[PDB]
């Protein structure tokens, strides 16, 4: 479930 | 004389100067914006995307929000992304103080006459409506303390029933509402219900944000948005 938002919040 | 929550939020609020520098650094190449005339749609889309990234970074540092699990953090941002972007634009105009032009986060100034020429009916309407809200907030003497409290209120505007951590967010909601009420009553006593008026302005921001989402959806259906656009990802709410 990789999303841009997730990469912004999961320090990566 | 200022609520603790607001004092804390002020410490996390960047300077319009640094945000501008940060975004122009992430944006900038050459073909439009620089030149001025005409106006880059793709560049403005990237500018809005970068503005939201700056907002997400602010949220990540915020008291309470920083204590939540990623799932709760994403749910909160999925509920308020458009409102935070609209409030950000509106506050920028309140400080700008010019009724015939709009100020962008990059520092670019756009004449409203230019918007009338280039924008379609939907976007033109959105820009004009935002300016009406700017006028209301200017008349209410909206200040930085109130602005940061409103941002926090919007961030935690979601009913706690949609989150895992209820107690933490519930307390934040109560603290924020109490802070805005206390601050406005103490600093602007002659504006009887400034607190209520500001909350009504948020109702207006919400309505405007929904119309903004409709504009984005229209652009999406016409395949006019840049690929991998973050605002469109937020619009799809599938994270
Ligand atoms: C979801 C909330 C997002 C908030 C984002 C706030 C961003 C403030 C940006 C203000 C930009 C003014 C540009 C004038 C450019 C001009 O007039 O350009 C005219 C063109 C529009 O042509 P048209 O598409 O109508 O053409 C139809 C036939 N060509 O547009 C652009 O370059 C638009 C690029 C804007 C990308 C912003 C994506 C954000 C949409 C939110 C729209 C929200 C307005 C909100 C007001 C509160």
XYZ file of N, CA and C and ligand atoms in Angstrom:
800
model
N 0.834 -1.232 0.000
C 0.000 0.000 0.000
C 0.856 1.265 0.000
N 1.954 1.274 -0.771
C 2.779 2.485 -0.780
C 2.084 3.655 -1.471
N 1.995 4.776 -0.765
C 1.382 5.987 -1.302
C 2.327 7.127 -0.976
N 2.175 8.251 -1.668
C 3.034 9.388 -1.404
C 2.865 9.823 0.052
N 1.618 9.932 0.503
C 1.350 10.350 1.876
C 2.077 9.457 2.880
N 2.012 8.145 2.668
C 2.663 7.210 3.576
C 4.171 7.441 3.645
N 4.799 7.714 2.504
C 6.240 7.955 2.501
C 6.592 9.258 3.215
N 5.634 10.176 3.296
C 5.872 11.447 3.968
C 5.774 11.302 5.484
N 4.974 10.339 5.934
C 4.751 10.116 7.358
C 5.593 9.014 7.987
N 6.053 8.071 7.175
C 6.860 6.975 7.690
C 8.343 7.256 7.489
N 8.726 8.516 7.683
C 10.113 8.917 7.527
C 10.834 8.125 6.456
N 10.267 8.119 5.254
C 10.866 7.388 4.154
C 9.890 7.180 3.014
N -1.070 35.746 29.361
C -2.305 36.276 28.719
C -2.648 35.489 27.456
N -1.768 34.569 27.075
C -1.986 33.742 25.890
C -2.007 32.267 26.278
N -3.013 31.515 25.805
C -3.101 30.090 26.136
C -1.833 29.325 25.773
N -1.470 28.368 26.621
C -0.279 27.558 26.403
C -0.268 26.915 25.021
N -1.400 26.352 24.612
C -1.480 25.701 23.309
C -1.069 26.633 22.174
N -1.543 27.873 22.218
C -1.203 28.832 21.180
C 0.277 29.207 21.223
N 0.827 29.350 22.426
C 2.241 29.674 22.561
C 3.076 28.549 21.945
N 2.660 27.309 22.177
C 3.370 26.157 21.620
C 3.264 26.149 20.096
N 2.057 26.365 19.582
C 1.848 26.369 18.138
C 2.650 27.460 17.436
N 2.799 28.613 18.078
C 3.571 29.692 17.478
C 5.023 29.251 17.283
N 5.513 28.438 18.212
C 6.889 27.948 18.152
C 7.121 26.971 17.007
N 6.037 26.453 16.440
C 6.127 25.500 15.339
C 5.758 26.120 13.997
N 5.306 27.370 14.025
C 4.894 28.059 12.808
C 6.054 28.744 12.097
N 6.389 28.266 10.889
C 7.475 28.801 10.066
C 7.233 30.235 9.621
N 8.296 30.864 9.139
C 8.238 32.232 8.656
C 7.826 32.146 7.192
N 6.931 33.030 6.769
C 6.475 33.044 5.385
C 7.697 33.075 4.470
N 8.794 33.606 5.002
C 10.054 33.719 4.279
C 10.721 32.376 3.998
N 10.851 31.549 5.030
C 11.493 30.248 4.884
C 10.666 29.263 4.068
N 9.347 29.324 4.211
C 8.480 28.429 3.454
C 8.664 28.739 1.973
N 8.676 30.028 1.651
C 8.853 30.487 0.278
C 10.174 29.980 -0.288
N 11.245 30.162 0.475
C 12.565 29.718 0.048
C 12.572 28.208 -0.174
N 11.967 27.479 0.758
C 11.902 26.024 0.686
C 11.180 25.530 -0.565
N 10.009 26.095 -0.836
C 9.222 25.687 -1.993
C 9.833 26.095 -3.333
N 10.380 27.302 -3.416
C 10.999 27.740 -4.662
C 12.210 26.854 -4.934
N 12.838 26.359 -3.873
C 13.990 25.493 -4.049
C 13.557 24.164 -4.642
N 12.398 23.684 -4.202
C 11.859 22.430 -4.690
C 11.205 22.676 -6.040
N 10.939 23.942 -6.342
C 10.314 24.301 -7.596
C 11.114 25.372 -8.313
N 11.288 25.214 -9.607
C 12.078 26.203 -10.296
C 12.891 25.514 -11.303
N 12.853 26.059 -12.497
C 13.607 25.438 -13.588
C 13.729 26.543 -14.618
N 12.604 26.858 -15.268
C 12.581 27.896 -16.289
C 11.683 27.677 -17.505
N 10.512 28.316 -17.504
C 9.539 28.212 -18.599
C 8.190 28.615 -18.036
N 7.963 29.926 -17.894
C 6.722 30.427 -17.314
C 7.056 31.242 -16.076
N 6.355 30.972 -14.968
C 6.558 31.664 -13.694
C 7.609 32.750 -13.698
N 8.814 32.323 -14.070
C 9.926 33.234 -14.243
C 9.282 34.142 -15.270
N 9.508 33.944 -16.557
C 8.898 34.825 -17.542
C 7.590 35.616 -17.225
N 6.688 35.072 -16.395
C 5.460 35.769 -16.009
C 4.163 35.507 -16.797
N 4.143 35.962 -18.072
C 3.010 35.879 -18.999
C 2.381 34.600 -19.478
N 1.098 34.429 -19.264
C 0.634 33.187 -19.731
C 0.473 32.405 -18.456
N 1.436 31.736 -17.816
C 1.196 30.999 -16.549
C 1.199 29.452 -16.637
N 2.153 28.834 -15.978
C 2.334 27.381 -15.960
C 1.388 26.605 -15.079
N 0.520 25.861 -15.716
C -0.412 25.043 -14.970
C 0.305 23.941 -14.193
N 1.208 23.219 -14.859
C 1.937 22.134 -14.205
C 2.777 22.620 -13.031
N 3.406 23.777 -13.199
C 4.242 24.339 -12.149
C 3.407 24.724 -10.931
N 2.228 25.290 -11.172
C 1.349 25.692 -10.079
C 0.829 24.461 -9.348
N 0.653 23.364 -10.079
C 0.195 22.120 -9.468
C 1.290 21.611 -8.535
N 2.535 21.681 -9.000
C 3.663 21.240 -8.192
C 3.821 22.147 -6.975
N 3.534 23.431 -7.159
C 3.628 24.401 -6.076
C 2.627 24.049 -4.976
N 1.406 23.704 -5.377
C 0.371 23.336 -4.411
C 0.764 22.039 -3.707
N 1.321 21.096 -4.463
C 1.770 19.823 -3.896
C 2.844 20.081 -2.840
N 3.801 20.943 -3.173
C 4.879 21.262 -2.250
C 4.367 22.001 -1.024
N 3.308 22.786 -1.196
C 2.741 23.508 -0.069
C 2.143 22.481 0.891
N 1.462 21.471 0.352
C 0.886 20.461 1.223
C 1.985 19.660 1.921
N 3.092 19.402 1.228
C 4.185 18.669 1.855
C 4.692 19.475 3.055
N 4.750 20.798 2.911
C 5.190 21.659 4.010
C 4.192 21.571 5.175
N 2.908 21.477 4.840
C 1.854 21.370 5.843
C 1.938 20.031 6.574
N 2.248 18.966 5.836
C 2.374 17.645 6.440
C 3.559 17.648 7.404
N 4.634 18.336 7.027
C 5.802 18.410 7.894
C 5.455 19.145 9.185
N 4.642 20.190 9.071
C 4.209 20.944 10.241
C 3.396 20.015 11.144
N 2.442 19.295 10.560
C 1.603 18.390 11.341
C 2.437 17.356 12.092
N 3.413 16.771 11.406
C 4.268 15.762 12.016
C 4.969 16.258 13.280
N 5.241 17.559 13.348
C 5.918 18.150 14.505
C 4.970 18.590 15.616
N 3.690 18.691 15.290
C 2.683 19.144 16.240
C 2.457 18.295 17.470
N 2.194 18.965 18.590
C 1.894 18.273 19.831
C 0.677 17.401 19.515
N 0.586 16.258 20.184
C -0.505 15.307 19.999
C -0.384 14.533 18.688
N -0.354 15.239 17.564
C -0.252 14.558 16.279
C 0.987 13.668 16.231
N 2.099 14.177 16.754
C 3.356 13.432 16.752
C 3.315 12.169 17.612
N 2.308 12.063 18.479
C 2.163 10.903 19.358
C 1.283 9.817 18.740
N 0.592 10.152 17.656
C -0.300 9.203 17.000
C 0.404 8.242 16.051
N -0.211 7.081 15.845
C 0.329 6.085 14.930
C 0.074 6.604 13.516
N 0.840 6.111 12.549
C 0.698 6.555 11.171
C -0.729 6.432 10.636
N -1.430 5.360 10.993
C -2.802 5.169 10.526
C -3.706 6.332 10.939
N -3.607 6.745 12.200
C -4.412 7.857 12.696
C -3.971 9.158 12.031
N -2.662 9.320 11.843
C -2.142 10.523 11.205
C -2.669 10.652 9.785
N -2.676 9.545 9.042
C -3.162 9.591 7.666
C -4.654 9.893 7.602
N -5.430 9.304 8.508
C -6.866 9.540 8.530
C -7.167 11.013 8.800
N -6.441 11.614 9.736
C -6.655 13.024 10.044
C -6.336 13.899 8.833
N -5.197 13.655 8.188
C -4.822 14.454 7.020
C -5.736 14.228 5.816
N -6.288 13.028 5.689
C -7.187 12.741 4.578
C -8.497 13.505 4.734
N -8.818 13.865 5.971
C -10.037 14.597 6.277
C -9.904 16.115 6.179
N -8.686 16.637 6.310
C -8.512 18.089 6.324
C -7.526 18.706 5.343
N -6.928 17.904 4.471
C -5.934 18.436 3.545
C -6.373 19.657 2.740
N -7.577 19.611 2.175
C -8.042 20.723 1.357
C -8.314 21.965 2.192
N -8.864 21.777 3.387
C -9.142 22.900 4.274
C -7.847 23.572 4.740
N -6.812 22.783 5.025
C -5.543 23.366 5.461
C -4.903 24.171 4.327
N -5.005 23.660 3.102
C -4.445 24.365 1.952
C -5.216 25.650 1.671
N -6.539 25.606 1.812
C -7.342 26.799 1.574
C -7.085 27.844 2.658
N -7.032 27.417 3.918
C -6.771 28.355 5.005
C -5.394 28.987 4.820
N -4.423 28.183 4.394
C -3.066 28.672 4.166
C -3.080 29.785 3.122
N -3.797 29.560 2.025
C -3.903 30.554 0.963
C -4.590 31.816 1.467
N -5.691 31.636 2.186
C -6.438 32.768 2.713
C -5.615 33.601 3.686
N -4.910 32.954 4.608
C -4.117 33.716 5.565
C -3.013 34.489 4.861
N -2.436 33.885 3.825
C -1.385 34.550 3.066
C -1.938 35.854 2.492
N -3.185 35.826 2.030
C -3.805 37.026 1.465
C -4.129 38.048 2.546
N -4.529 37.576 3.724
C -4.854 38.483 4.818
C -3.626 39.328 5.156
N -2.462 38.691 5.232
C -1.230 39.410 5.545
C -0.744 40.250 4.369
N -0.989 39.763 3.158
C -0.598 40.456 1.930
C -1.295 41.821 1.866
N -2.592 41.829 2.151
C -3.353 43.070 2.168
C -3.576 43.842 0.878
N -3.785 43.140 -0.230
C -4.037 43.794 -1.513
C -5.297 43.198 -2.136
N -6.284 44.045 -2.416
C -7.540 43.574 -2.991
C -7.567 43.377 -4.502
N -6.519 43.797 -5.201
C -6.502 43.645 -6.653
C -5.549 42.570 -7.162
N -4.883 41.877 -6.246
C -3.954 40.824 -6.635
C -3.873 39.747 -5.565
N -3.343 38.590 -5.948
C -3.180 37.458 -5.044
C -1.696 37.141 -4.913
N -1.281 36.739 -3.718
C 0.110 36.387 -3.470
C 0.235 34.871 -3.371
N 1.197 34.309 -4.095
C 1.436 32.869 -4.070
C 2.561 32.584 -3.091
N 2.652 31.340 -2.637
C 3.681 30.968 -1.674
C 5.102 31.175 -2.203
N 5.252 31.200 -3.524
C 6.561 31.400 -4.147
C 6.945 32.874 -4.149
N 5.978 33.734 -3.850
C 6.238 35.162 -3.840
C 5.671 35.837 -5.075
N 5.223 35.031 -6.034
C 4.650 35.551 -7.268
C 3.330 36.257 -6.983
N 3.135 37.415 -7.603
C 1.908 38.174 -7.426
C 1.096 38.058 -8.710
N -0.178 37.708 -8.575
C -1.047 37.564 -9.733
C -2.221 38.526 -9.643
N -2.357 39.389 -10.644
C -3.455 40.346 -10.676
C -4.769 39.593 -10.822
N -5.818 40.062 -10.156
C -7.107 39.395 -10.272
C -7.644 39.559 -11.690
N -7.209 40.616 -12.371
C -7.637 40.851 -13.745
C -7.094 39.716 -14.608
N -5.917 39.219 -14.241
C -5.275 38.125 -14.957
C -6.056 36.836 -14.732
N -6.576 36.660 -13.523
C -7.352 35.462 -13.230
C -8.638 35.474 -14.057
N -9.262 36.641 -14.176
C -10.493 36.756 -14.948
C -10.246 36.366 -16.406
N -9.056 36.674 -16.906
C -8.717 36.356 -18.288
C -8.368 34.885 -18.514
N -7.537 34.328 -17.638
C -7.074 32.949 -17.779
C -7.917 31.826 -17.181
N -8.576 32.090 -16.062
C -9.354 31.047 -15.406
C -10.726 30.763 -15.988
N -11.137 29.503 -15.873
C -12.455 29.111 -16.327
C -13.421 29.575 -15.249
N -14.718 29.410 -15.480
C -15.724 29.845 -14.515
C -15.563 29.265 -13.112
N -15.314 27.962 -13.024
C -15.168 27.305 -11.726
C -14.016 27.887 -10.913
N -12.813 27.885 -11.479
C -11.671 28.414 -10.752
C -11.825 29.893 -10.439
N -12.342 30.659 -11.390
C -12.514 32.083 -11.157
C -13.384 32.273 -9.924
N -14.475 31.513 -9.862
C -15.405 31.573 -8.739
C -14.692 31.261 -7.426
N -13.858 30.225 -7.436
C -13.119 29.829 -6.239
C -12.205 30.946 -5.755
N -11.458 31.541 -6.679
C -10.542 32.615 -6.325
C -11.279 33.795 -5.713
N -12.395 34.180 -6.327
C -13.187 35.303 -5.841
C -13.812 35.023 -4.483
N -14.279 33.793 -4.282
C -14.885 33.425 -3.009
C -13.840 33.463 -1.902
N -12.631 32.999 -2.200
C -11.569 33.026 -1.208
C -11.277 34.476 -0.820
N -11.317 35.383 -1.795
C -11.066 36.790 -1.502
C -12.147 37.365 -0.598
N -13.381 36.887 -0.745
C -14.463 37.368 0.106
C -14.171 36.944 1.545
N -13.660 35.728 1.718
C -13.316 35.237 3.049
C -12.144 36.030 3.615
N -11.216 36.417 2.747
C -10.071 37.199 3.183
C -10.577 38.516 3.762
N -11.554 39.117 3.089
C -12.121 40.382 3.545
C -12.791 40.210 4.909
N -13.530 39.116 5.087
C -14.203 38.866 6.360
C -13.196 38.728 7.489
N -12.132 37.970 7.244
C -11.110 37.750 8.258
C -10.310 39.009 8.566
N -10.128 39.859 7.562
C -9.420 41.120 7.756
C -10.267 41.999 8.678
N -11.574 42.027 8.430
C -12.499 42.822 9.236
C -12.553 42.313 10.675
N -12.347 41.009 10.848
C -12.357 40.388 12.170
C -11.020 40.559 12.889
N -10.048 41.135 12.190
C -8.713 41.359 12.740
C -8.019 40.048 13.087
N -8.145 39.065 12.203
C -7.511 37.767 12.410
C -6.009 37.960 12.597
N -5.459 37.415 13.677
C -4.024 37.539 13.905
C -3.334 36.175 13.862
N -2.010 36.177 13.979
C -1.227 34.942 13.897
C -1.586 33.903 14.952
N -1.891 34.360 16.163
C -2.256 33.460 17.254
C -3.522 32.696 16.906
N -4.505 33.415 16.375
C -5.763 32.802 15.985
C -5.555 31.876 14.793
N -4.722 32.297 13.846
C -4.442 31.483 12.670
C -3.856 30.119 13.039
N -2.827 30.100 13.880
C -2.246 28.812 14.231
C -3.229 27.950 15.011
N -4.088 28.573 15.813
C -5.063 27.798 16.564
C -6.100 27.211 15.596
N -6.474 27.981 14.578
C -7.434 27.502 13.585
C -6.848 26.334 12.797
N -5.557 26.410 12.475
C -4.896 25.325 11.747
C -4.977 24.045 12.568
N -4.686 24.163 13.859
C -4.727 23.021 14.766
C -6.156 22.484 14.879
N -7.129 23.386 14.958
C -8.529 22.981 15.043
C -8.937 22.209 13.793
N -8.483 22.672 12.634
C -8.808 22.003 11.381
C -8.138 20.631 11.339
N -6.868 20.576 11.724
C -6.134 19.312 11.721
C -6.858 18.245 12.540
N -7.409 18.647 13.683
C -8.123 17.715 14.546
C -9.639 17.891 14.477
N -10.143 18.253 13.304
C -11.579 18.468 13.119
C -12.386 17.181 12.975
N -11.698 16.064 12.774
C -12.354 14.770 12.607
C -12.911 14.215 13.916
N -14.099 13.617 13.855
C -14.699 13.034 15.051
C -13.778 11.903 15.488
N -13.484 11.839 16.781
C -12.585 10.821 17.309
C -13.020 9.384 17.046
N -14.296 9.184 16.734
C -14.785 7.835 16.479
C -14.114 7.202 15.261
N -13.482 8.027 14.432
C -12.810 7.531 13.235
C -11.336 7.216 13.472
N -10.895 7.343 14.718
C -9.499 7.110 15.062
C -9.308 6.028 16.113
N -8.074 5.554 16.242
C -7.759 4.542 17.243
C -7.613 5.226 18.597
N -6.822 6.295 18.639
C -6.595 7.019 19.888
C -7.645 8.104 20.116
N -8.708 7.754 20.833
C -9.793 8.689 21.114
C -9.454 9.741 22.164
N -9.055 9.280 23.344
C -8.728 10.162 24.457
C -7.742 11.284 24.142
N -6.672 10.958 23.427
C -5.660 11.949 23.094
C -6.197 13.052 22.185
N -6.875 12.660 21.114
C -7.427 13.621 20.166
C -8.593 14.415 20.755
N -9.407 13.754 21.574
C -10.551 14.399 22.211
C -10.058 15.557 23.069
N -9.006 15.302 23.838
C -8.433 16.323 24.700
C -7.874 17.467 23.860
N -7.253 17.136 22.732
C -6.689 18.157 21.855
C -7.796 19.052 21.296
N -8.920 18.446 20.928
C -10.049 19.194 20.389
C -10.593 20.162 21.434
N -10.759 19.672 22.658
C -11.267 20.511 23.734
C -10.279 21.630 24.050
N -8.991 21.297 24.094
C -7.962 22.288 24.395
C -7.906 23.393 23.343
N -8.021 23.012 22.073
C -7.971 23.979 20.981
C -9.168 24.919 21.000
N -10.362 24.365 21.184
C -11.545 25.208 21.227
C -11.476 26.149 22.424
N -11.017 25.638 23.563
C -10.900 26.455 24.767
C -9.878 27.575 24.579
N -8.760 27.258 23.928
C -7.714 28.244 23.689
C -8.177 29.372 22.777
N -8.847 29.024 21.683
C -9.311 30.051 20.762
C -10.341 30.948 21.444
N -11.243 30.342 22.210
C -12.273 31.107 22.910
C -11.630 32.039 23.928
N -10.722 31.499 24.730
C -10.045 32.303 25.740
C -9.240 33.438 25.112
N -8.435 33.117 24.102
C -7.620 34.129 23.450
C -8.454 35.264 22.857
N -9.481 34.916 22.089
C -10.307 35.939 21.468
C -11.052 36.800 22.481
N -11.522 36.188 23.563
C -12.245 36.932 24.594
C -11.332 37.905 25.330
N -10.097 37.486 25.581
C -9.141 38.325 26.296
C -8.465 39.395 25.446
N -8.151 39.069 24.196
C -7.468 40.012 23.318
C -8.372 40.879 22.445
N -9.602 40.429 22.217
C -10.554 41.185 21.407
C -11.910 41.190 22.099
N -11.957 41.705 23.337
C -13.194 41.762 24.118
C -14.351 42.518 23.478
N -14.043 43.474 22.608
C -15.092 44.256 21.971
C -15.705 43.612 20.739
N -15.252 42.404 20.426
C -15.808 41.649 19.314
C -16.548 40.513 20.008
N -17.704 40.865 20.568
C -18.564 39.948 21.299
C -18.387 38.458 21.104
N -18.638 37.981 19.893
C -18.485 36.562 19.646
C -17.538 36.320 18.492
N -16.317 36.827 18.634
C -15.305 36.637 17.603
C -15.087 35.141 17.419
N -15.099 34.402 18.527
C -14.917 32.953 18.499
C -15.929 32.301 17.551
N -17.215 32.580 17.752
C -18.253 32.019 16.891
C -18.073 32.451 15.438
N -17.717 33.713 15.224
C -17.526 34.203 13.866
C -16.385 33.463 13.178
N -15.324 33.166 13.922
C -14.205 32.432 13.337
C -14.640 31.010 12.999
N -15.462 30.400 13.850
C -15.935 29.049 13.571
C -16.820 29.058 12.327
N -17.587 30.130 12.142
C -18.433 30.236 10.955
C -17.543 30.399 9.724
N -16.412 31.083 9.890
C -15.479 31.236 8.782
C -14.938 29.858 8.401
N -14.766 28.975 9.384
C -14.288 27.626 9.083
C -15.359 26.862 8.308
N -16.630 27.139 8.590
C -17.715 26.492 7.852
C -17.592 26.937 6.387
N -17.276 28.213 6.188
C -17.109 28.760 4.847
C -15.886 28.143 4.171
N -14.809 27.951 4.932
C -13.595 27.341 4.380
C -13.904 25.913 3.929
N -14.684 25.194 4.727
C -15.054 23.828 4.382
C -15.852 23.797 3.073
N -16.801 24.717 2.923
C -17.613 24.758 1.710
C -16.750 25.080 0.496
N -15.814 26.000 0.683
C -14.920 26.402 -0.385
C -13.991 25.246 -0.755
N -13.525 24.515 0.255
C -12.634 23.380 0.021
C -13.346 22.284 -0.771
N -14.639 22.092 -0.522
C -15.374 21.073 -1.261
C -15.447 21.483 -2.728
N -15.652 22.771 -2.969
C -15.708 23.244 -4.342
C -14.341 23.092 -4.998
N -13.277 23.258 -4.215
C -11.922 23.096 -4.737
C -11.711 21.635 -5.143
N -12.248 20.710 -4.352
C -12.127 19.295 -4.676
C -12.871 19.000 -5.969
N -14.010 19.659 -6.173
C -14.778 19.460 -7.397
C -13.988 19.962 -8.605
N -13.261 21.064 -8.428
C -12.432 21.605 -9.502
C -11.347 20.584 -9.836
N -10.683 20.056 -8.809
C -9.632 19.065 -9.017
C -10.177 17.812 -9.694
N -11.378 17.387 -9.308
C -11.975 16.202 -9.911
C -12.221 16.437 -11.401
N -12.674 17.639 -11.742
C -12.928 17.988 -13.137
C -11.621 17.885 -13.925
N -10.550 18.438 -13.366
C -9.245 18.394 -14.014
C -8.779 16.955 -14.161
N -9.040 16.153 -13.136
C -8.656 14.753 -13.149
C -9.345 13.996 -14.284
N -10.656 14.174 -14.413
C -11.405 13.481 -15.462
C -10.953 13.881 -16.857
N -10.431 15.096 -16.987
C -9.969 15.570 -18.279
C -8.504 15.256 -18.517
N -7.913 14.486 -17.607
C -6.508 14.101 -17.695
C -5.625 15.337 -17.852
N -5.933 16.377 -17.084
C -5.185 17.628 -17.145
C -4.186 17.790 -16.007
N -4.278 16.924 -15.005
C -3.372 16.996 -13.866
C -2.082 16.240 -14.138
N -0.960 16.733 -13.596
C 0.329 16.070 -13.793
C 0.232 14.679 -13.188
N 0.977 13.727 -13.732
C 0.927 12.387 -13.181
C 1.592 12.410 -11.808
N 1.164 11.504 -10.938
C 1.698 11.401 -9.584
C 1.470 12.655 -8.752
N 0.410 13.391 -9.066
C 0.091 14.601 -8.320
C -0.408 14.207 -6.925
N 0.170 14.820 -5.895
C -0.196 14.510 -4.518
C -1.624 14.908 -4.157
N -2.082 16.055 -4.649
C -3.443 16.486 -4.333
C -4.456 15.501 -4.894
N -4.171 14.939 -6.064
C -5.078 13.963 -6.649
C -5.037 12.685 -5.809
N -3.865 12.335 -5.280
C -3.790 11.151 -4.425
C -4.690 11.386 -3.214
N -4.628 12.590 -2.648
C -5.458 12.917 -1.493
C -6.941 12.899 -1.877
N -7.249 13.370 -3.081
C -8.629 13.410 -3.565
C -9.222 12.000 -3.654
N -8.392 11.032 -4.033
C -8.835 9.649 -4.173
C -9.009 8.938 -2.829
N -8.426 9.508 -1.778
C -8.524 8.968 -0.421
C -8.474 7.448 -0.350
N -7.422 6.860 -0.907
C -7.285 5.408 -0.908
C -6.016 4.918 -0.221
N -5.403 5.773 0.588
C -4.180 5.398 1.288
C -4.505 4.726 2.618
C -7.657 21.779 -2.631
C -7.357 23.166 -2.113
C -6.100 23.620 -2.817
C -5.735 25.000 -2.366
C -4.595 25.464 -3.254
C -4.535 26.954 -3.013
C -3.734 27.311 -4.192
C -3.970 28.758 -4.340
C -3.548 28.873 -5.769
C -4.053 30.171 -6.353
C -3.680 30.102 -7.817
C -4.258 31.264 -8.632
C -3.762 31.009 -10.020
C -4.411 31.902 -11.054
C -3.941 31.070 -12.171
C -4.816 31.305 -13.275
O -5.808 32.036 -13.232
O -4.636 30.265 -13.973
C -5.638 30.040 -14.865
C -5.303 28.488 -14.697
C -6.580 27.903 -14.973
O -7.067 27.784 -16.146
P -8.422 26.880 -15.996
O -7.835 25.540 -15.361
O -9.605 27.286 -15.138
O -8.612 26.855 -17.585
C -9.736 26.241 -18.157
C -9.383 26.369 -19.648
N -7.876 26.453 -19.673
O -4.921 27.799 -13.662
C -3.978 27.410 -13.152
O -2.728 27.689 -13.253
C -4.488 26.615 -11.923
C -3.456 25.947 -11.120
C -4.050 25.981 -9.714
C -3.412 24.550 -9.134
C -4.046 24.804 -7.914
C -4.624 23.425 -7.794
C -5.374 23.972 -6.705
C -6.762 24.089 -7.116
C -7.237 24.707 -5.896
C -7.956 25.788 -6.677
C -8.190 26.468 -5.479
C -8.348 27.894 -5.561
C -8.550 28.089 -4.185
C -8.757 29.432 -3.852
C -8.989 29.311 -2.406
